[PDB]
Symmetry: D2
Subunit: 251 residues, 4 copies
Amino acid sequence: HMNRIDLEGRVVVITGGARGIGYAVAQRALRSGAAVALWDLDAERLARSERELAELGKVCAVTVDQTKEAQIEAAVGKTLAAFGAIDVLINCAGITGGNGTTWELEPDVWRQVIDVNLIGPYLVCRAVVPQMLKQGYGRIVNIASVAGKEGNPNASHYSASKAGLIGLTKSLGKELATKNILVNAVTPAAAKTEIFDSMKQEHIDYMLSKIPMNRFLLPDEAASLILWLGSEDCAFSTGSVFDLSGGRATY
Amino acid sequence: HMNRIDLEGRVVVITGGARGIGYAVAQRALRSGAAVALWDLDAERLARSERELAELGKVCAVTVDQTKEAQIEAAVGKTLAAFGAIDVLINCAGITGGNGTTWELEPDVWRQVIDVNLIGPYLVCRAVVPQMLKQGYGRIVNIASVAGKEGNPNASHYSASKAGLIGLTKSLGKELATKNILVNAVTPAAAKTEIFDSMKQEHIDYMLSKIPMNRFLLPDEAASLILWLGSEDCAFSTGSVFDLSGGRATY
Amino acid sequence: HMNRIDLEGRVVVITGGARGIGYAVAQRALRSGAAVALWDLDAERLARSERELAELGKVCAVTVDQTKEAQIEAAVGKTLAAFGAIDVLINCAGITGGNGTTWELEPDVWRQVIDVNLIGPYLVCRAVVPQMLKQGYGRIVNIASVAGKEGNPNASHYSASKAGLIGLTKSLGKELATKNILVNAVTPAAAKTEIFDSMKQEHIDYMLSKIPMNRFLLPDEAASLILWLGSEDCAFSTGSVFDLSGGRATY
Amino acid sequence: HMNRIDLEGRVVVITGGARGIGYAVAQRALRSGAAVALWDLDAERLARSERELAELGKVCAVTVDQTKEAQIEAAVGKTLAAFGAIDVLINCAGITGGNGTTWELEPDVWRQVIDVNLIGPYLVCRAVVPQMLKQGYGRIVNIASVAGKEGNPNASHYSASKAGLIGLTKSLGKELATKNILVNAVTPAAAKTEIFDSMKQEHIDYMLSKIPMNRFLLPDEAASLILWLGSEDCAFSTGSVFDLSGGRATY
Ligand SMILES: NC(=O)c1ccc[n+]([C@@H]2O[C@H](COP(=O)([O-])OP(=O)(O)OC[C@H]3O[C@@H](n4cnc5c(N)ncnc54)[C@H](O)[C@@H]3O)[C@@H](O)[C@H]2O)c1
Ligand SMILES: NC(=O)c1ccc[n+]([C@@H]2O[C@H](COP(=O)([O-])OP(=O)(O)OC[C@H]3O[C@@H](n4cnc5c(N)ncnc54)[C@H](O)[C@@H]3O)[C@@H](O)[C@H]2O)c1
């Protein structure tokens, strides 16, 4: 009994599309009638995901490091050559940077998390917004985290980067509010994906204990809301934050 | 290009269903396959709305003052006799109480706004939750306001009541988080309905000036998100607040 | 090493002044040079508290039920007869209403908590604000709770009442923003106003598990911030919420 | 009638101390009995500010780029040689980065704002926290902005950097909550640190239209709250955000 999201005729770019939440978003988008451009850093995994997802619809895989402007420019070009538009942008491709106190983390890792998780979505938005303006239509969905609302201990870099991504979402949504391009963020709690391998077990336990629903988020459940925000039904919500924390968040 | 929300086989109670946002929710729910129990104080208008909406699906109209426990009990009984379940509850039936400073409003009007807008949804939830527990399923959607997030000047009673409704939503969602009944609120900005007749023109202008999208909310747009929250696709969001303010709200 | 708050020549009304946080605020206000009007329900506890506090400065004990307009009017008159002004209003008369799920609490207790915790501060503000407008100066501090930010399970009435009090604070602060009367709320965690039952150590452990500082708030610590908000140095903060949750709150 | 903040015997580091809010904080800290280490980039402005402030108490001027680990290490050493401790850290070195839409700002300016406004305070905290842990005491105050709560249009980099700084504050406060080092942020509105161009009265009117108090924040008013958060009376607030927006912020 899933809702039938209407993405017919639309083109959806998904960063981080090779695995995890991004891959589940790709599956649901293809089942909703979209063409999907799957953007990811991991060229080998991306090839396997492309061939799996092609069974569901039109897919174009693009290898891109979303911290590098020149690679993003080439990715926009390849996407437009395949499909002719970018109607929907899902920024999904973050890293955790491991766990440690603010003063014990390595500064190069702190900077890397800010680069991948905050600078990256900024650079992708900078490249894609002019195309959405050209179209007179777009939807942008930034995948943040409940950590960006809350400031998790032992995850200061991750939390600051996702809090910053929420701030970017609020500014960009207000800049585009009269231009038919709506821009929102989602705040998931932990979902059991491969990103768990980059964290300490005690941090995973901590994240679970704070969830009133008493289980982790499933990627398919995340995709339901993410693609709602990528659809025309999302019509009067912009610069806003939509929660996926299983009852945890208090705002 | 609207999404097809799957409410097939479900029963939706809508308070305030005779007009405005509640009526638009009823239309969309019927088009989504739900049976609708339309609850409202205005017995005459409710009869006209029932006969209009019956063209779209199964409708049972129920006259009820949602400040009166005994009338709510009778309304639950009438709804169950018609349709056998209450799967979804949309609390929509608020009043504004006019406009004036906190110290110049009449205390009886201040109390009346709290009664209708906060006590009322509490009493309806109290009566309906045991039925949802009996079913092993429910969705509750409380229609608050951006005023409940922000505290509008000259609307202290309305703002306090809607802020209180958000607090109730957060408590109730956490109480039910392991019971398969998810509970969320929405925060609309102003929509041009008959509720405008109860406010001063300068307050209407104030509300509009704060909207980055530069227009009012349409009832049909509100219904898209309200019924998403009333669907099974809403799966890992509870005790949460979903915005409909056209870019205004900053949280 | 406590700060010396300058309340010299100011008159402070404290509701709930005979007990708990209100009593600690009274002690600190007298030590800061204020005259204090202690407003409370229990004439006997008031008389005892007045005798103790008179050793610190000028105190007027006022018996008043802050849910009753006529008693508030008599209380304002008695305060003005004693001291000639009301410069600062501290609303600290809240009750908890016990604990239970939203659908199992008694409706009359739900209503009583709304009346005491939300209607009461509204009624006191509506009587006191006109006096502050005559003076051209005032400070209002509403004691809310972290429950008003978060929606605690099994405390839906308490949480809704405190969330509503925060909404009132936001509206009233904006109404008075050019009138030299600043209006703010505080959100304490679990405050150690009472030694709990010797059999509830498990529940005490649970409450402390939500507080990163791993102890309860002391009333004297609350009074430091409450009276800062009651002082002239609070100069550019209004309609705002100041946290006292020991690291718990995430906004 | 200002409060007498007790900073007797304490050492306060102020980044951005030569100008604006940082200079006003220095004046108030010296008047409160503190020794002040003024940290700033401009040796010339630092020397002028040091000469003026030395009339109020003990001051050590430290030339440091707070984006450079090696310079921060030299700055901590010079501060400890002069004064023997760092009890209080005020991070007040932010830049605006100009204005423009998200897609038209220069990426190197976007990165520079993140570096100065988010990476810099992180680097200063990582050097100073170990010293506060050796002392068994500290207070950290991060000067953020209302833009970090709200996401101002045409200031996406500034807003994201300040939102990220708030996230860092929340994580670091919780990491230190049992270590006697409390960590909080302030959110000023438009502060009158500089007289704006004589031709921008229309833009000044627009900024003031968003502030209910209808004037700009004064640096000395900001310093009252900033140093309260730097004092022992700030005792049960950590990982929190204290507002200085003149009624604008809605959380
Ligand atoms: N998984 C969770 O529990 C969880 C919780 C909260 C938020 N989130 C967020 O959701 C998003 C998806 O998480 P996930 O669990 O699917 O993660 P994941 O590790 O399974 O997948 C992330 C993907 O991003 C790609 N990627 C990383 N850096 C990149 C870069 N510079 N350029 C391009 N691609 C890059 C990786 O190759 C990978 O395929 C992330 O932004 C994450 O922060 C996840
Ligand atoms: N319309 C807006 O601009 C706007 C903005 C923000 C929030 N909201 C909220 O959305 C909801 C719907 O607003 P609307 O514009 O459709 O209002 P409306 O005035 O058009 O309809 C409200 C309905 O509620 C009914 N009602 C009132 N008191 C009742 C009671 N005690 N018991 C039962 N029914 C009762 C009325 O008869 C009416 O049919 C309200 O809760 C309102 O506060 C509306």
